[PDB]
Amino acid sequence: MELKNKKWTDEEFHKQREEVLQQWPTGKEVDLQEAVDYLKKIPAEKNFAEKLVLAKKKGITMAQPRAGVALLDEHIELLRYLQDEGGADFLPSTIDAYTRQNRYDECENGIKESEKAGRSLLNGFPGVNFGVKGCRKVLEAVNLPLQARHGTPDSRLLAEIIHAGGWTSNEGGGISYNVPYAKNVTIEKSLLDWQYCDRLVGFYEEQGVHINREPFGPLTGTLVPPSMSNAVGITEALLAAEQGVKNITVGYGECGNMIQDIAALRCLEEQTNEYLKAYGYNDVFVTTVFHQWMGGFPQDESKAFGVIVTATTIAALAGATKVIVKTPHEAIGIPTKEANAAGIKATKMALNMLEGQRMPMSKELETEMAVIKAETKCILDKMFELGKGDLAIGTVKAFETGVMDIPFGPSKYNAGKMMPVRDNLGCVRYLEFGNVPFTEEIKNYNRERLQERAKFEGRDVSFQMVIDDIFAVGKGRLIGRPE
Amino acid sequence: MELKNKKWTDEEFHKQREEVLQQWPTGKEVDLQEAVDYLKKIPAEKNFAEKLVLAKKKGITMAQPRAGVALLDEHIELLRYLQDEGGADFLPSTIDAYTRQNRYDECENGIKESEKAGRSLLNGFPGVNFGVKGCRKVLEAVNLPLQARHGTPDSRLLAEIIHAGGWTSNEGGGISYNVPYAKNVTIEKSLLDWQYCDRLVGFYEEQGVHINREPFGPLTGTLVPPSMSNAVGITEALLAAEQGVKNITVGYGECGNMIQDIAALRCLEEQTNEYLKAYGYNDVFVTTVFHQWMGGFPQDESKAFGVIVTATTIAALAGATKVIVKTPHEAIGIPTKEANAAGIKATKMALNMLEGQRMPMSKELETEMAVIKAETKCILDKMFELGKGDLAIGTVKAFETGVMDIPFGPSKYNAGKMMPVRDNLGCVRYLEFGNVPFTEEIKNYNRERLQERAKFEGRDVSFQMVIDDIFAVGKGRLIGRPE
Amino acid sequence: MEKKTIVLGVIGSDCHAVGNKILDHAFTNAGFNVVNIGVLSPQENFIKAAIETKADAILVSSLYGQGEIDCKGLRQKCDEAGLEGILLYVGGNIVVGKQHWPDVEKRFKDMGYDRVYAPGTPPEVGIADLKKDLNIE
Amino acid sequence: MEKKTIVLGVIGSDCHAVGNKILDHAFTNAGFNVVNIGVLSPQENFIKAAIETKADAILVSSLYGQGEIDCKGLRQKCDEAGLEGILLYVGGNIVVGKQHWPDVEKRFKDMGYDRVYAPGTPPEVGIADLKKDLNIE
Ligand code: B12
Ligand code: B12
Ligand SMILES: C[C@H]1O[C@@H](n2cnc3c(N)ncnc32)[C@H](O)[C@@H]1O
Ligand SMILES: C[C@H]1O[C@@H](n2cnc3c(N)ncnc32)[C@H](O)[C@@H]1O
Ligand SMILES: N[C@@H](CCC(=O)O)C(=O)O
Ligand SMILES: N[C@@H](CCC(=O)O)C(=O)O
């Protein structure tokens, strides 16, 4: 197929569907006519899109963990624990990494090994292998909405199965579930395959079935400048809306400076709404998700709580619709159900200690929001120019030319030229600009911010600072200070 | 002695000293000549006053736990752990409650019983009984400054012993170590007895020895409005300065609304400096301490961390010089050294995650500060009016007439008329004013704020709401909402 | 519920007052005559109040941790006072630190307390136990 | 010494890339020739690169947890490839979840790994072990 930012026709989509469902025998379990009626019978309390609307109406931040294991009963047991003992507002199912690479043969092997070992040897739930019948068992066993959380460049079959499975949200997008999660996949092909996932939600919404979509904001979770991360989310929201998506959660990964973070999340929500409306998408319901610190954690569990709850406080004060919970086991391995519920309990307690509180406007905040929107607009403007009005083509070309460039992405289609580093107050800034198309004024403000750190630490700003920042939180602080 | 807000003469103070030192045989270990030379040999790194000056200069928040047990070696081992494994910046020694009531006989029994049992049966360190020799062994075993933390209406002997013992800060004051901590001590007597403690620091300062004093801000720890708490600390700062105190940490207990809390700490610091200067004390070095949530804690340890770390974030953004650390054992009992190091590590991580960050000014903040300063001025103004210019006499009369009224204080000299309650954003407000001398405009604003709560919860504001608020945090949230 | 009298206080050198206020409120609201002797109360004050008011029970609150010391002996003084079989309850945060609760309950029951309560005990629990114990549910 | 060569990669279906960038930089700075095959690397890519570059050691990073599956068998393919005696290192977050480390270490040594590293291992440790093992300290 040729890539264009245009809604796929019904015939186009069906033709692709018949090919996708053949990629694993559980594809045979997907019946759209049957799935629509199943979906319509799920109570509103278990519909992710409808519960987001309620949370926005109530002014509350909802808490959602990450969770998944190889075997079906164990996976349900785990979700039930997070629900019941954790107090989760939303439930995930975290998909294993073989699934994410479309290796269902390896999924099956790992299911077998997990059965023998009595513990999960997969780092997540093999949804394709468990099929629609398994994903339905999961939904039926819990009392909260379910979302597929993962990181899959070609997610078409997974999406068909989890949504027919009654899972009413799908996370991801053609940039955010490519560049952080892949090496060899072109940006053209991941955008085409994510148009499928979005078009599938479009179909369901045309039938009156409401299903949330959530672009993955934090990307590599490693010093991503807010303006670069927001440009990706806004892009993914626009490309989703063109295929008919109506309920979108845009996301942002904590950088650590509270004002920068709140500015980023507000700019993200505002510019996303602004762009959708500017391009004629006038019926899209937009929510926000704040992810707690997605870089390296401290191994000490008490220090991990220091990270989890300061992150939550930022989320709370930002007015985030949703916050994704980290656990005291983050530095070490996939959390036990206990460690996970500790994360959720700590998180929800912080939220409840901050009920209705918001960060008030300040000059400091105003200034930072203006920086982030201008930066973001530089990028987006360039993308539209390169695509000659077509944002999907513009994205392909932006990656080809370093206009969009994600720090530390493994994708060979990512330039890897732009270098981020923190300033003296811990805000993430641009150290090296690469081909990111900023004006001199924007570039000079980043340099000015960064010189204040050089002066204070008595060393030139440098890649060594970057490495220090990569290690800082695991070593007990935000900023990679010398010694 | 007659109570007047006037520095004691050397002769007056010496006469009192010869009386005080006879109250327990350890008083014979106090030699002021020898003690000044001992104190001057303490390195600056172990002097509480000096280190606070350093912290102010660096714009960092320092973390201090609470801690104390009955036996000397055990006590030392505990503090060393908190220093080494916890990372504390200042060390306490929390005095047991028998000492606080001057029952050294019971201390002694408790020391023997603890030896026999292999664990502390006292809820603190009996400094009078351990004497100057023991207090010095504590100091010599650690590498951080030491402070006596307690709640003692008649602290004169204690103060002579811990200061001669090399501890370079004493917490307390004539109001704050009476009303939350005693039932039958007149305000006149505790003001007089705290004049002694202040006067002793004054002596030491006259000799070139720097010693910190810290009025106890949180009082009963139970919904104390910022303006009532701040009036008490400002007063104790003024009364200490009159006796020659030169290094003063004023304190505030978290109420839980971040803007109210940061407004409260800034108003406290600013009005303390203003009042000191207006009354001619021009060489007083003032710092602030923020106490993490002093009300009932949740029993679950993960939720406890939610409270500990949210509280720290507020302290951090407030620019508190010091933060007092709570532990995950708070709801249950005196923390083990491990629970305590956990609280300190979580706290210090949060601080380090927020390095250099401050709440920027906003309209909301300026409005709250204006309310707080105004309320506080109303009270102080009346106090000076009642004392005909003498704030100490005015304090006694304020308590007699209920101009100053501390919620839930056990003191029978406390009116018990004023009643606090939270508003719809969790700010602590005045529900019943009793004899607190506010203008109608000030009362009206409190009423307006509370009505928003009534509207939202569907019930009139009431003492039932007060009870709900007293239990709310232990049941998982800041505001006692219906259910 | 049929009216009965209890003495309520906080023992020894303990000044915690908020729980006392709430316990008074809740027990009063449940139909008891609460004789509240308040904070910082030695054994003798509880006993005096019980006799003067012919109390059915004595509820000893101890929050500060030293109640393991302060609570020893009350049953004996009550017997010497002519209060044999009076109900003796103890609750709050009655020992120093987190301890294995079955150990603590046995320690205080061996001391002569009828009922021993762990941290965070709701008033309603003691109200139910007290009604049952006085055969007035 | 004499520029020693290592193959460095991330095994299996694992896409984590930051550790890899840092390991590359640190070992390069310590004087090694780093042949970095990058992420999502199957066993056969480690072996091919080790053959072509006559590598002295293969450093297998595994962060995503399924390394316990993925890592099985490398030693035998290496021998079958004519790389008997090659040094094989494995580290990162090599099992799913928090586990008792001596048990984990044992399991991978049993797989034929010369050295096995726990979460949070500083590259300097691997650099010191590798210089020792290659007798170039
Ligand atoms: C950043 C991050 C990500 C980013 C990665 C972006 C990218 N492409 O690089 C994103 C958000 C995309 C992500 C994704 C996922 N992640 Co991740 N991630 C992390 C995180 C938070 C920090 C990793 C990091 O970069 N650290 C900084 C670098 C410098 O250090 P490092 O990677 O630890 O490597 C150092 C050391 O380990 C050591 N080292 C490593 N290898 C070797 C080898 C030798 C021989 C030696 C001497 C030393 C050594 O030296 C390195 C350099 O200093 C960790 C948790 C943590 N550490 O707090 C989880 C973590 C590694 N992620 C994890 C998982 C589960 C996933 C996913 C696989 C989820 C899933 N179910 O599919 C996906 C990836 C999909 C895939 N196909 O693999 C788990 C692994 C769980 C386990 N083993 O039990 C972790 C531990 C989190 C957790 N607790 O669950 N993640
Ligand atoms: C507020 C507070 C204070 C305030 C008290 C103000 C006042 N005068 O009331 C201040 C800050 C002044 C303070 C002081 C000190 N405190 Co204090 N305080 C608390 C705190 C934070 C909450 C207490 C509270 O009011 N809760 C709310 C009320 C409604 O609940 P409650 O008091 O628990 O009572 C309820 C239940 O226990 C139960 N209940 C209680 N008794 C009984 C009896 C029966 C028969 C029944 C059925 C039920 C029952 O029902 C009650 C009513 O709802 C607790 C910790 C916590 N719980 O989180 C520590 C706590 C009680 N304090 C403690 C201590 C150590 C002290 C001091 C003694 C310090 C010292 N070393 O000297 C001093 C007091 C000096 C003295 N002479 O006693 C410890 C006790 C440690 C232990 N037992 O191991 C605690 C547990 C904190 C800790 N974890 O270290 N404190
Ligand atoms: C990308 C982030 O997702 C989380 N994550 C990844 N896989 C799981 C799992 N199976 N269970 C819980 N959390 C997980 C980790 O906390 C990681 O760092
Ligand atoms: C007043 C606050 O001080 C703390 N506190 C009281 N006494 C001790 C002690 N000996 N050790 C540690 N913390 C203590 C409690 O956390 C309490 O609520
Ligand atoms: N996009 C996923 C990443 C976590 C994972 O890799 O499992 C999320 O936000 O949960
Ligand atoms: N004023 C004391 C109260 C704690 C105690 O009661 O020991 C402090 O701030 O530590």
Side-chain angles (χ1 to χ4, degrees), chain D residues 27-39:
Chain D
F27 275 82
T28 290
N29 279 6
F32 291 90
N33 179 210
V34 182
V35 178
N36 189 350
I37 59 170
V39 309

PDB file of all heavy atoms in Angstrom, chain D residues 27-39:
ATOM      1  N   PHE D  27      34.047   0.420  27.117  1.00  0.00           N
ATOM      2  CA  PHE D  27      35.037  -0.570  26.677  1.00  0.00           C
ATOM      3  C   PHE D  27      35.924   0.039  25.597  1.00  0.00           C
ATOM      4  O   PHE D  27      37.113  -0.268  25.474  1.00  0.00           O
ATOM      5  CB  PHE D  27      34.356  -1.850  26.195  1.00  0.00           C
ATOM      6  CG  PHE D  27      34.032  -2.828  27.322  1.00  0.00           C
ATOM      7  CD1 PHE D  27      32.902  -2.671  28.103  1.00  0.00           C
ATOM      8  CD2 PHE D  27      34.857  -3.888  27.606  1.00  0.00           C
ATOM      9  CE1 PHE D  27      32.609  -3.546  29.120  1.00  0.00           C
ATOM     10  CE2 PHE D  27      34.570  -4.793  28.613  1.00  0.00           C
ATOM     11  CZ  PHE D  27      33.437  -4.625  29.393  1.00  0.00           C
ATOM     12  N   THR D  28      35.350   0.934  24.789  1.00  0.00           N
ATOM     13  CA  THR D  28      36.201   1.580  23.783  1.00  0.00           C
ATOM     14  C   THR D  28      37.240   2.443  24.490  1.00  0.00           C
ATOM     15  O   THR D  28      38.433   2.449  24.175  1.00  0.00           O
ATOM     16  CB  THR D  28      35.342   2.374  22.797  1.00  0.00           C
ATOM     17  OG1 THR D  28      34.604   1.447  21.988  1.00  0.00           O
ATOM     18  CG2 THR D  28      36.204   3.216  21.867  1.00  0.00           C
ATOM     19  N   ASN D  29      36.765   3.179  25.496  1.00  0.00           N
ATOM     20  CA  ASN D  29      37.652   4.053  26.254  1.00  0.00           C
ATOM     21  C   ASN D  29      38.686   3.267  27.037  1.00  0.00           C
ATOM     22  O   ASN D  29      39.804   3.737  27.299  1.00  0.00           O
ATOM     23  CB  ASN D  29      36.841   4.988  27.158  1.00  0.00           C
ATOM     24  CG  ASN D  29      36.311   6.179  26.368  1.00  0.00           C
ATOM     25  OD1 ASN D  29      36.451   6.265  25.149  1.00  0.00           O
ATOM     26  ND2 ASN D  29      35.687   7.113  27.072  1.00  0.00           N
ATOM     27  N   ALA D  30      38.399   2.035  27.427  1.00  0.00           N
ATOM     28  CA  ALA D  30      39.383   1.184  28.072  1.00  0.00           C
ATOM     29  C   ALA D  30      40.376   0.546  27.097  1.00  0.00           C
ATOM     30  O   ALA D  30      41.303  -0.147  27.524  1.00  0.00           O
ATOM     31  CB  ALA D  30      38.678   0.079  28.858  1.00  0.00           C
ATOM     32  N   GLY D  31      40.218   0.739  25.802  1.00  0.00           N
ATOM     33  CA  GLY D  31      41.228   0.319  24.839  1.00  0.00           C
ATOM     34  C   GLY D  31      40.824  -0.877  24.016  1.00  0.00           C
ATOM     35  O   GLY D  31      41.637  -1.471  23.299  1.00  0.00           O
ATOM     36  N   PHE D  32      39.548  -1.276  24.108  1.00  0.00           N
ATOM     37  CA  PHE D  32      39.129  -2.418  23.309  1.00  0.00           C
ATOM     38  C   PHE D  32      38.609  -1.984  21.944  1.00  0.00           C
ATOM     39  O   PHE D  32      38.118  -0.875  21.785  1.00  0.00           O
ATOM     40  CB  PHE D  32      38.028  -3.235  24.000  1.00  0.00           C
ATOM     41  CG  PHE D  32      38.520  -3.968  25.225  1.00  0.00           C
ATOM     42  CD1 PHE D  32      38.488  -3.391  26.479  1.00  0.00           C
ATOM     43  CD2 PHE D  32      39.034  -5.260  25.102  1.00  0.00           C
ATOM     44  CE1 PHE D  32      38.931  -4.038  27.602  1.00  0.00           C
ATOM     45  CE2 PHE D  32      39.476  -5.922  26.219  1.00  0.00           C
ATOM     46  CZ  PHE D  32      39.452  -5.324  27.466  1.00  0.00           C
ATOM     47  N   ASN D  33      38.742  -2.931  21.030  1.00  0.00           N
ATOM     48  CA  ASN D  33      38.062  -2.915  19.757  1.00  0.00           C
ATOM     49  C   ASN D  33      36.654  -3.487  19.947  1.00  0.00           C
ATOM     50  O   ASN D  33      36.488  -4.692  20.096  1.00  0.00           O
ATOM     51  CB  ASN D  33      38.822  -3.720  18.698  1.00  0.00           C
ATOM     52  CG  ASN D  33      38.147  -3.753  17.345  1.00  0.00           C
ATOM     53  OD1 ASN D  33      38.305  -4.741  16.625  1.00  0.00           O
ATOM     54  ND2 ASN D  33      37.393  -2.733  16.953  1.00  0.00           N
ATOM     55  N   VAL D  34      35.657  -2.617  19.938  1.00  0.00           N
ATOM     56  CA  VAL D  34      34.303  -3.075  20.179  1.00  0.00           C
ATOM     57  C   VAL D  34      33.521  -3.272  18.888  1.00  0.00           C
ATOM     58  O   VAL D  34      33.248  -2.345  18.120  1.00  0.00           O
ATOM     59  CB  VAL D  34      33.513  -2.101  21.062  1.00  0.00           C
ATOM     60  CG1 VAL D  34      32.116  -2.679  21.322  1.00  0.00           C
ATOM     61  CG2 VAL D  34      34.252  -1.860  22.366  1.00  0.00           C
ATOM     62  N   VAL D  35      33.161  -4.537  18.674  1.00  0.00           N
ATOM     63  CA  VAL D  35      32.349  -4.854  17.497  1.00  0.00           C
ATOM     64  C   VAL D  35      30.914  -4.953  18.005  1.00  0.00           C
ATOM     65  O   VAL D  35      30.511  -5.943  18.598  1.00  0.00           O
ATOM     66  CB  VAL D  35      32.814  -6.137  16.796  1.00  0.00           C
ATOM     67  CG1 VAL D  35      31.929  -6.468  15.599  1.00  0.00           C
ATOM     68  CG2 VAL D  35      34.263  -5.976  16.367  1.00  0.00           C
ATOM     69  N   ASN D  36      30.190  -3.867  17.780  1.00  0.00           N
ATOM     70  CA  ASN D  36      28.860  -3.731  18.349  1.00  0.00           C
ATOM     71  C   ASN D  36      27.779  -4.063  17.345  1.00  0.00           C
ATOM     72  O   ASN D  36      27.557  -3.268  16.428  1.00  0.00           O
ATOM     73  CB  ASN D  36      28.707  -2.288  18.841  1.00  0.00           C
ATOM     74  CG  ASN D  36      27.425  -2.137  19.643  1.00  0.00           C
ATOM     75  OD1 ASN D  36      26.590  -3.021  19.670  1.00  0.00           O
ATOM     76  ND2 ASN D  36      27.364  -1.000  20.296  1.00  0.00           N
ATOM     77  N   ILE D  37      27.158  -5.215  17.516  1.00  0.00           N
ATOM     78  CA  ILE D  37      26.102  -5.673  16.614  1.00  0.00           C
ATOM     79  C   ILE D  37      24.716  -5.172  17.011  1.00  0.00           C
ATOM     80  O   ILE D  37      23.719  -5.399  16.322  1.00  0.00           O
ATOM     81  CB  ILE D  37      26.062  -7.212  16.570  1.00  0.00           C
ATOM     82  CG1 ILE D  37      25.826  -7.850  17.938  1.00  0.00           C
ATOM     83  CG2 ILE D  37      27.305  -7.789  15.908  1.00  0.00           C
ATOM     84  CD1 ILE D  37      25.544  -9.335  17.873  1.00  0.00           C
ATOM     85  N   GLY D  38      24.643  -4.493  18.147  1.00  0.00           N
ATOM     86  CA  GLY D  38      23.458  -3.764  18.532  1.00  0.00           C
ATOM     87  C   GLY D  38      22.358  -4.641  19.067  1.00  0.00           C
ATOM     88  O   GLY D  38      22.529  -5.777  19.467  1.00  0.00           O
ATOM     89  N   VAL D  39      21.148  -4.073  19.076  1.00  0.00           N
ATOM     90  CA  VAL D  39      20.042  -4.779  19.705  1.00  0.00           C
ATOM     91  C   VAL D  39      19.359  -5.792  18.800  1.00  0.00           C
ATOM     92  O   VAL D  39      19.623  -5.865  17.596  1.00  0.00           O
ATOM     93  CB  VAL D  39      18.977  -3.772  20.212  1.00  0.00           C
ATOM     94  CG1 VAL D  39      19.589  -2.684  21.050  1.00  0.00           C
ATOM     95  CG2 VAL D  39      18.218  -3.178  19.053  1.00  0.00           C
TER      96      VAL D  39
END
